Structure 1
């Protein structure tokens, strides 16, 4: 038996705004995510900066569904 995959089709697609604060690697992000923690870590790791520098804000998502 086979079962085909599936697209999430959340009406709102992926989206991020990043604000760099110019001081000490600080960055503030607005993002359509179910996972602000991994968002914060992945961004810290890419920048080579401690996690305490990165702030992620999530008001609402237009759908997530695991995607």
Structure 2
């Protein structure tokens, strides 16, 4: 049995905006799992959640 592309009509898309205070980031992203986005971004920046 062959695979299959998700083929959501909206491609992968995000905007990451640093606030400029206390290394606060806001992440606007087309995802199904915000808490996971928060984790991997915080980890990558070595920041608390």
Q: Do these two structures clear the TM 0.5 threshold for a shared fold by scoring above it?
A: yes
Please give the per-residue CA displacement for 1:14-59, whole angstroms capped at 9, x wherever unaligned.
Answer: 11101101111100111100000000000000000000xxxxxxxx
Q: CA-atom RMSD, angstroms?
A: 0.5
Any gaps of 5 or more consecutive residues in structure 1? Answer: 52-67
- In 2, the alpha carbon distance for the partners of 1:47 and 1:19 equals 13
- In 2, the alpha carbon distance for the partners of 1:46 and 1:29 equals 13
- In 1, the alpha carbon distance for the partners of 2:22 and 2:46 equals 12
Map of 1:38 onto structure 2: 36
- In 2, the alpha carbon distance for the partners of 1:9 and 1:32 equals 14
- In 2, the alpha carbon distance for the partners of 1:12 and 1:5 equals 20
Q: Secondary structure at the match of 2:17?
A: strand
Greater relative CO, 1 or 2 (CA 8 Å, sep 6+): 1
- In 2, the alpha carbon distance for the partners of 1:44 and 1:29 equals 11
Any gaps of 5 or more consecutive residues in structure 2? Answer: none
